[PDB]
Design an enzyme around this catalytic site. Structure first.
Site, PDB file in Angstrom:
ATOM      1  N   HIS A   1      -5.795   5.798 -48.246  1.00  0.00           N
ATOM      2  CA  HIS A   1      -5.652   5.013 -49.359  1.00  0.00           C
ATOM      3  C   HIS A   1      -6.156   3.754 -49.398  1.00  0.00           C
ATOM      4  O   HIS A   1      -5.898   3.091 -50.533  1.00  0.00           O
ATOM      5  CB  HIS A   1      -4.228   5.258 -50.157  1.00  0.00           C
ATOM      6  CG  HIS A   1      -3.368   4.586 -49.535  1.00  0.00           C
ATOM      7  ND1 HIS A   1      -2.495   5.064 -48.316  1.00  0.00           N
ATOM      8  CD2 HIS A   1      -2.694   3.446 -49.799  1.00  0.00           C
ATOM      9  CE1 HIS A   1      -1.581   4.017 -47.945  1.00  0.00           C
ATOM     10  NE2 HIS A   1      -1.768   3.182 -48.692  1.00  0.00           N
TER      11      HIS A   1
ATOM     12  N   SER B   1       1.444  -0.526 -44.455  1.00  0.00           N
ATOM     13  CA  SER B   1       0.722   0.954 -44.910  1.00  0.00           C
ATOM     14  C   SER B   1      -0.411   0.967 -44.135  1.00  0.00           C
ATOM     15  O   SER B   1      -1.246   0.088 -44.004  1.00  0.00           O
ATOM     16  CB  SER B   1       0.247   0.788 -46.409  1.00  0.00           C
ATOM     17  OG  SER B   1      -0.384   2.049 -46.768  1.00  0.00           O
TER      18      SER B   1
ATOM     19  N   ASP C   1      -3.718  11.855 -46.041  1.00  0.00           N
ATOM     20  CA  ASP C   1      -3.953  10.303 -46.195  1.00  0.00           C
ATOM     21  C   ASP C   1      -4.288   9.686 -44.929  1.00  0.00           C
ATOM     22  O   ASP C   1      -3.392   8.792 -44.312  1.00  0.00           O
ATOM     23  CB  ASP C   1      -2.627   9.838 -46.769  1.00  0.00           C
ATOM     24  CG  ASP C   1      -3.054   8.453 -47.268  1.00  0.00           C
ATOM     25  OD1 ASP C   1      -4.248   8.065 -47.492  1.00  0.00           O
ATOM     26  OD2 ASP C   1      -2.068   7.487 -47.390  1.00  0.00           O
TER      27      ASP C   1
END
Ligand SMILES: *[C@@H]1O[C@H](CO)[C@@H](O[C@@H]2O[C@H](CO)[C@@H](O[C@@H]3O[C@H](CO)[C@@H](O)[C@H](O)[C@@H]3O)[C@H](O)[C@H]2NC(C)=O)[C@H](O)[C@H]1NC(C)=O
Ligand SMILES: *[C@@H]1O[C@H](CO)[C@@H](O[C@@H]2O[C@H](CO)[C@@H](O)[C@H](O)[C@H]2NC(C)=O)[C@H](O)[C@H]1NC(C)=O
Ligand SMILES: *[C@@H]1O[C@H](CO)[C@@H](O[C@@H]2O[C@H](CO)[C@@H](O)[C@H](O)[C@H]2NC(C)=O)[C@H](O)[C@H]1NC(C)=O
Ligand SMILES: [Mg+2]
EC number: 3.4.21.47
Lengths: 528, 274, 640, 91
Positions: free
Chosen positions: B34, B207, B84
């Site tokens: 992402h 992340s 992801d």
């Protein structure tokens, strides 16, 4: 023994059902019953008993029972000698065989006794485990009992707390010991004042009727009543089911009020009378509150808003009254002309902000108008005299968060005895002013100055209704109803306690919340 | 943390995307999917490792075939972080040094030795080792004032797994999700919370980072930091008042092995058949 | 003037299907109906909307069922309501109904009843709805120490698990002795909490059990013979015990005991049996009060102790709570209605029990008023009486006694209750009674419900049908009609009893007409009935072996299990030596129905003070367009 | 010989094991764990006996072999910080 089997079925169709216990006996003609204590002290000589049963109906048995050697014990049985007796067990009887031993080491140890009968293919053995508790006595010293509460006994939000090592000076040689660290949250729920009983409000249910002004005076007591009962949830004691009759009145008065709506999206006593800036703004105030009760046409609600902004508003942001209502009694504390620019501008400003979330798409000049009026009230808030104006204006600035510094200091000190915003004369003007101030406090989220104010309104028992009580009714119940939502049950419960041991590389971090409070959270340490 | 990779993306005034990744080979850098979009070109994506001041030029970003973040807009789900994961093939070969080293991946001969298991160890056996049916102790690397620091967490893979997963309902947007299992696929590992301990929460900048399991003096990546329920990170400090439902989800590497084993075939990582 | 009525349970349940009965008196042709349920306060729509049409082919009755959320909008204290609304074409009939936050029932099972420090507690949670069926729900589980402080809490879910949550808790070696507690509850009902206890203590399983059964389950004060107690002691494997026994007595009055050192005995235990007697002399001498009637109400307790001749084991037993009553029986009007109809027969559900509480089999009972009118108590401990009532509005008082022979009148029991008149709408003296042949109902049989009417012939020709509703486990099991022609004072209803009626079911019947001056009158009545309480399905566990002899330690044995199809069977084996130390908190089917029945929305055993009272007391809310509605219900649990 | 775990317990290790010609059982040791401790259940290697049910941090366990058999490995194992028993699995 006899095993008791218990079955429980669970059918997705039939349901749940627990069956009747089924017993299963398990016996043997010849067996050993080695009964040992729960625990035995080390170094203390004890005696265990081995009962050899013989349930052979008619036959004696020449048995030879033996106790196996074990380094953890001290018996007449060695690694090279067998401590074994030979006895004869009569038919349908039993015999007890004594064994003296001495636990040499602590911990769970193993004991095993075997036996075999002569001239037969029969034998049996038993192997059980017995605990060996060290010599001494179970003690427990309370090292310390600290109180966790940063802020009160903290510093910069943190709180350090050292904990001295346990004494254990009189400890028994060669024995373990664990320290039991323990945390727990302590609630701490407090506050909240009693709400006005619905039983005292069986008269606010009025049927709206009259001209463009007499209709609003009769619609107000009903709207603010249902609104206060929906929050405090007192429809049970009030009557219940009767609410349906109160809604049809609000809708009935709503439709009637439209019959007094001039094409200019404004309102007045009559369709021929000149538009009134106050009445129109007031209609916005009530309608914006009854949006959760009945269906309000956005064209009408936003129509009155746009009329106030574009038409009746100077660049100064000041709102002026052109055709004052005939009923000078429903305007509340605005009848007095001392400071009309600060009073009316605020009154109208509030009606706009209470309809901002609705007319935020249809009226583009709303955020601009709101800022304008705010700029004017912030320039003359330090010159106000009457406690009334100070309140109604302060609540207008509070909804913007523009009530800081000197302006905030005056709004608080204006209240006499820190519980009311009163002015020499009348009751209507005192109760109304205080209600505005309460809404301003609940807006500033200052729940430290609120309790005295709320308690004052309650200890004054004003159940609205009457002549010229239009403003004192809609405001006092709007403030007390708002207080019933902004009232916490407890205080913040979010402790981040972390204990670091020297024998450990990482910290032990815990977090206590309101819901998870009163929870036993222990961390054990075999090291002192 | 030699395996630690710092990924940045430049966009026309829109801002800059700050993610992290791990060096898995001499050419690839495993990260979240992402962090990038189909619109982002290679020239606008710079990767930095070993703390080197310079930025490395990438060759191509490999997304997982099943990655579709908008494949739930019909059901009313804005975000869908399923599968992801993504790989970044560098244009230049990395010279392993004291600051740049790879991190072990599941189902590889190299990892088997790290766990000191018999060579005849199947892939399934490694998963039972690294991710047993309990509260697995793990950790991840976060950026603390331009300084890397570790954060110990617990992977709720035991019975607490259910308590951790359902908390996804509190996440922004998921508030009206009918079945919570529809947004938390079996490709997710769950960490954070208050039980059995108060775990640190991943930040936006973290992340894509590796979810590492330190065992027997060796580090093994078992997940990729995908998304969290509550955003406690806010470039000013860490929201000292974290909720109890502030959970963090990751991508279980044992679930995207086919994709990894395939794309890394020429990396001498020696993946296991199984 | 057409009249449209509506009937729903007093309290609606979340995440379930509540039944809703629609009617129309009388009208003709078709009549569309749109049922809409909102919240409260406010008209926040919409929760559940259903539709249906009343066709004259069905006598104008509809079966519409809705399922209330299941919404996070229902979140402390106070109560929450919903605006149940029903539109009959144009005429709209609305009624607010209370809402229960209860999801269903939770049952907790633990392998043992007592555990030693260091062992593990194996327990299971059963997640059923308000109908005792499996369901996927989120459950919170806590573990409180003896002092009531949570030490462990988790959040599980029976989802995809078939209403069974296998669990375990490890008991620390250094733990606190005492009665630990396992508390649990649904996430959507934090208030309704289920719990089960288990004892943590250091112990060792005995080799034999000890039983102390007195000759009688009580004691007569003037009984010179005294209190004879039997001492039965046998090994866990059946064999009989050879040893000595130490038995002592004492008196218990309140939460306080008074030992009797004078009543110490040492009887031998030969052939696994013994015998000890408590002389009445020592009993009275135990206290000091000259009177012997002051002991009436108090109780005695026995403390036995058997010891083998080998001195290897020693077991302690006890039998406490021995009622010292003057009458070997008791009488309870707890099952008998508290309202009567002037002139009409009044039935009584006499409940004759023993001093301990167990039902009394075959016990003649009659009323002070009339003789010969008797009835031997059945096995369930229930008798069937019926006395005649006068048209007077004077409160009714009944006094039932025991005509048990072989016993003087001074040694008999007696009880007196009071019934009140049934108020009539307009004093029209229109009543309704439902007599039912009181016999032990069993699933599969048939019950005859009797509809007795009372009114002048001036409007009796308007009563063409009754409307009966079946209440069961707090829901509407069924609703139908009962035809009637002018001239029939008593009709019969062929009611078929199935497995659903278990354990108990209420039957309410009402009729409506336009008698008197001219005004829609309503008359109703209710009657509670118990059924043979047992499993809805079946589950048996017998031995697979061909009988033969007894098994041997370390042998294979077959275990035959006869249950329902597709059902999951969770097992557990426990040594009987365990129950010797603790036989409490054992999960039993009887205990399950106990929870189900002790949760009914109905209170009164039948009838009420008026028409709108019979409904509320039974567990229903009648509302019409004519104005007649039932009382408001705010409290969740029954009054008192 | 095959192994099975009670409810609420997960089984790791060889479910079925066969007695081989080398006098050893095939496959790995069967362990029934509930994963409720800082460290997992060390298990009880076939032929041994474990003394210690608490699997907290700093906790320990001890193993003993049947008569006539020699214990190979560690006789005592301590649960170390970072979820990992000390020493090696007994046999
Ligand atoms: C431990 O041993 C048991 C016994 O074999 C294993 O369970 C078995 O699983 C196999 C594979 O599904 C089943 O084999 C079946 O054989 C029959 C023979 O006619 C055949 O008709 C079926 O098509 C199938 O191939 C077997 O039925 C089943 N045993 C049962 C259920 O009794 C188990 O997997 C082993 N545990 C391990 C090693 O994980
Ligand atoms: C250490 O803790 C134990 C367990 O709580 C304490 O034991 C107490 O002893 C009394 C004796 O009557 C018992 O009722 C309970 O076991 C305990 N009392 C209570 C209510 O705490 C013990 O007192 C503590 N320290 C000492 C002095 O040993
Ligand atoms: C529910 O609705 C229908 C009428 O529309 C009926 O329900 C039936 O219940 C009976 C048993 O009493 C079954 O034999 C039928 O199969 C059911 N109907 C259907 C469609 O399955 C009845 O009128 C209503 N039942 C209630 C709750 O009173
Ligand atoms: Mg029954």
């Amino acid at each position: 023994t006899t095993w008791e089997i218990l079955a429980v079925s669970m059918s997705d169709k039939k349901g749940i059902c627990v069956a009747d216990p089924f017993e299963v006996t398990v016996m043997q003609d010849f067996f050993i019953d080695l009964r040992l204590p729960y625990s035995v002290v080390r170094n203390e000589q004890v005696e265990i008993r081995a009962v050899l049963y013989n349930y052979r109906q008619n036959q004696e048995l020449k048995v030879r029972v033996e106790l196996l050697h074990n380094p953890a014990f001290c018996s007449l049985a060695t690694t090279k000698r067998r401590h074994q007796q030979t006895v004869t067990i009569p038919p349908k009887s039993s015999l007890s065989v004594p064994y003296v031993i001495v636990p040499l080491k602590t911990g769970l140890q193993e004991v095993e006794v075997k036996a075999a009968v002569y001239h037969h293919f029969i034998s049996d053995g038993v192997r059980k485990s017995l605990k060996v508790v060290p010599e001494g006595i179970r003690m427990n010293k309370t090292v310390a009992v600290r109180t966790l509460d940063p802020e009160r006994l903290g510093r910069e939000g943190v709180q350090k707390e050292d904990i001295p090592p346990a004494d254990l000076s009189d400890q028994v040689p060669d024995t373990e010991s664990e320290t039991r660290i323990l945390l727990q949250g302590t609630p701490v729920a407090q506050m909240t004042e009693d709400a006005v009983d619905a039983e005292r409000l069986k008269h606010l249910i009025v049927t709206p009727s009259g001209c463009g002004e007499e209709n609003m005076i009769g619609m107000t007591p009903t709207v603010i009543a249902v609104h206060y009962l929906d929050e405090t949830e007192q429809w049970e004691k009030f009557g219940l089911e009767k609410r349906q009759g109160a809604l049809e009145l609000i809708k009935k008065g709503y439709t009637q009020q439209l019959a007094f709506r001039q094409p200019s999206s404004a309102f007045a006593a009559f369709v021929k009378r000149a538009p009134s800036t106050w009445l129109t703004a007031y209609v916005v105030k009530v309608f914006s509150l009854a949006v959760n009760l009945i269906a309000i046409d956005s064209q009408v609600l936003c129509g009155a808003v746009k009329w106030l902004i574009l038409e009746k508003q100077k660049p100064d942001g000041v709102f002026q009254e052109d055709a004052p209502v005939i009923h000078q009694e429903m305007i509340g504390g605005l009848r007095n002309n001392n400071e009309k620019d600060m009073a009316l501008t605020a009154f109208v400003l509030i009606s706009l902000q209470e309809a901002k979330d609705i007319c935020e798409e249809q009226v583009n000049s709303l955020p601009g108008s709101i800022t304008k009026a705010g700029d004017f009230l912030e320039a003359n808030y330090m010159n106000l005299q009457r406690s009334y104006t100070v309140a109604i204006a302060g609540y207008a600035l509070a909804q913007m968060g523009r009530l800081k510094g000197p302006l905030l200091n005056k709004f608080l000190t204006t209240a006499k005895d820190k519980n009311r915003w009163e002015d020499p004369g009348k009751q209507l003007y005192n109760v109304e002013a205080t209600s505005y101030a309460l809404l301003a406090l609940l807006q500033l989220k200052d729940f430290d100055f609120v309790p005295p104010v709320v308690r004052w309104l309650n200890e004054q028992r004003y159940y609205g209704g009457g002549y010229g009580s239009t403003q004192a009714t809609f405001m006092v119940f709007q403030a007390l109803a708002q207080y019933q939502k902004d009232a916490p049950d407890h205080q913040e419960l979010n402790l981040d306690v972390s204990l670091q041991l020297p024998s450990r590389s990482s910290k032990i971090t815990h977090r206590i919340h309101w819901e998870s409070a009163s929870l036993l959270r222990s961390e054990e340490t075999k090291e002192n | 943390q030699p395996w630690q990779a710092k990924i940045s993306v430049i966009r026309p005034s829109k801002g800059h995307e700050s993610c992290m990744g791990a060096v898995v080979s001499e050419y690839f850098v495993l990260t979240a999917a992402h962090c990038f979009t189909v619109d982002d070109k290679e020239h606008s994506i710079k990767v930095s490792v070993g703390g080197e001041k310079r930025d490395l030029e990438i060759e191509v970003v490999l997304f997982h075939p099943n990655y579709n973040i908008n494949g739930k807009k019909e059901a009313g789900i804005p975000e869908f972080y399923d599968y992801d994961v993504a790989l970044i093939k560098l244009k230049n070969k990395l010279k392993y040094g004291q600051t740049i080293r790879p991190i072990c991946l599941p189902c590889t001969e190299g990892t088997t030795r790290a766990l000191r298991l018999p060579p005849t160890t199947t892939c399934q056996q490694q998963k039972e080792e690294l991710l047993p049916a309990q509260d697995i102790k793990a950790l991840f690397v976060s950026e603390e004032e331009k300084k890397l620091t570790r954060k110990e967490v617990y992977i709720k893979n035991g019975d607490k797994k259910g308590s951790c997963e359902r908390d996804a309902q509190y996440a922004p947007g998921y508030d009206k999700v009918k079945d919570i299992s529809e947004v938390v696929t079996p490709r997710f590992l769950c960490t954070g919370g208050v039980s059995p301990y108060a775990d640190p929460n991943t930040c936006r900048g973290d992340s894509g980072g590796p979810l590492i399991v330190h065992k027997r003096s060796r580090f093994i990546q078992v997940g990729v930091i995908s998304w969290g329920v509550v955003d406690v990170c806010k470039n000013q400090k860490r929201q000292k008042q974290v909720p109890a439902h502030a959970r963090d989800f990751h991508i279980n590497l044992f679930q995207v092995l086919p994709w990894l084993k395939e794309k890394l075939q020429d990396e001498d990582l020696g993946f296991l058949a199984a | 003037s057409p009249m449209y009525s509506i009937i729903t349970p007093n309290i609606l349940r979340l995440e379930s299907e509540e039944t809703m009965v629609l009617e129309a008196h009388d009208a003709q042709g078709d009549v569309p109906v749109t049922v809409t349920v909102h919240d409260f306060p406010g008209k926040k729509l919409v929760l559940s909307s259903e539709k249906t049409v009343l066709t004259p082919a069905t006598n104008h009755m509809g079966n519409v069922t809705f399922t209330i959320p299941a919404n996070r909008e229902f979140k402390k204290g106070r109560n929450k309501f919903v605006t149940v609304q029903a539109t009959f074409g144009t005429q709209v009939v609305e009624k607010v109904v209370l809402v229960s936050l209860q999801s269903g029932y939770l049952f907790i099972q633990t392998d043992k009843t007592i555990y030693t420090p260091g062992s593990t507690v194996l327990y299971r949670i059963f997640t059923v709805n308000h109908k005792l069926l499996p369901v996927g729900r989120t459950v919170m589980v806590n573990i409180e120490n003896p002092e009531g402080i949570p030490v462990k809490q988790d959040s599980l879910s029976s989802q995809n698990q078939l209403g069974v949550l296998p669990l375990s808790w490890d008991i620390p070696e250094l733990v606190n002795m005492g009665q630990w507690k396992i508390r649990a509850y649904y996430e959507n009902s934090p208030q309704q909490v289920f719990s089960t206890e288990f004892e943590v203590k250091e112990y060792v399983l005995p080799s034999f059990e000890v039983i102390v059964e007195p000759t009688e389950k009580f004691y007569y004060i003037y009984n010179e013979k005294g209190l004879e107690v039997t001492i039965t002691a046998r090994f866990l494997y059946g064999k009989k015990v050879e040893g000595t026994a130490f038995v002592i007595f004492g008196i218990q009055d309140g939460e306080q005991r008074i030992s009797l050192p004078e009543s110490l005995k040492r009887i031998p235990i030969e052939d696994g049996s013994g015998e000890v007697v408590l002389s009445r002399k020592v009993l009275l001498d135990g206290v000091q009060n000259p009177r012997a009637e002051d002991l009436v109400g108090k109780s005695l307790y026995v403390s036995a102790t058997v010891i083998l001749h080998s001195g290897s084991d020693m077991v302690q037993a006890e039998r406490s709570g021995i009622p010292i009553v003057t009458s070997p029986y008791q009488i309870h009007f707890t099952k008998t209605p508290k309202y009567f109809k002037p002139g009409m027969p009044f039935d009584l559900m006499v409940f004759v029990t023993n001093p301990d509480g167990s039902p009394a089999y075959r016990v003649p009972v009659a009323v002070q008023g009339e003789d010969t009118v008797q009835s031997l108590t059945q096995g369930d401990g229930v008798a069937k009486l019926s006395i005649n009532t006068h048209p007077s509005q004077k409160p009714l008082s009944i006094t039932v006694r025991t005509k048990k022979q072989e016993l003087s009148e001074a040694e008999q029991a007696t009880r007196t209750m009071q019934a009140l008149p049934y108020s009539t709408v307009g004093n029209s003296n229109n009543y309704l009674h439902l007599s039912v042949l009181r016999t032990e109902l069993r699933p599969g049989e048939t019950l005859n419900v009797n509809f007795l009417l009372r009114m002048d012939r001036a409007h009796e020709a308007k009563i063409r049908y009754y409307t009966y509703l079946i209440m069961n486990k707090g829901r509407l099991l069924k609703a139908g009609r009962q035809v009637r022609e002018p001239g029939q004072d008593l009709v019969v209803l062929p009611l078929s009893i199935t497995t659903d009626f278990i354990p108990s079911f209420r039957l309410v019947a009402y009729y409506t007409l336009i008698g008197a001056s001219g005004q829609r009158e309503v008359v109703a009545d209710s009657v509670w009935v118990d059924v043979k309480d047992s499993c809805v399905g079946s589950l048996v566990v017998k031995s697979g072996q061909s009988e033969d002899r007894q098994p041997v330690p370390g042998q294979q044995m077959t275990l035959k299990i006869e249950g329902d199809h597709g059902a999951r069977v969770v097992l557990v084996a426990v040594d009987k030596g365990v129950f010797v130390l603790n036989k409490k908190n054992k999960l039993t089917q009887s205990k399950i129905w106990d929870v189900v029945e002790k949760a009914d929305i109905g209170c009164t055993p039948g009838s009420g003070k008026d028409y709108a009272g019979v409904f509320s007391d039974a567990g229903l809310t009648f509302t019409s367009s004519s104005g007649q509605q039932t009382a408001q219900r705010a409290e969740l649990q029954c009054p008192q | 010989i095959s192994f099975h775990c009670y409810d609420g317990y997960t089984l790791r290790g060889s479910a079925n094991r066969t007695c081989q010609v080398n006098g050893r059982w095939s496959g790995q040791t069967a362990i029934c764990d509930n994963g409720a401790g800082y460290c997992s259940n060390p298990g009880i290697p076939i032929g041994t006996r474990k003394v210690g049910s608490q699997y907290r941090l700093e906790d320990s366990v001890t193993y003993h072999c049947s008569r006539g058999l020699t214990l190979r490995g560690s006789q005592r194992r301590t649960c170390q910080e970072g979820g990992s028993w000390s020493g090696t699995e007994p046999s």
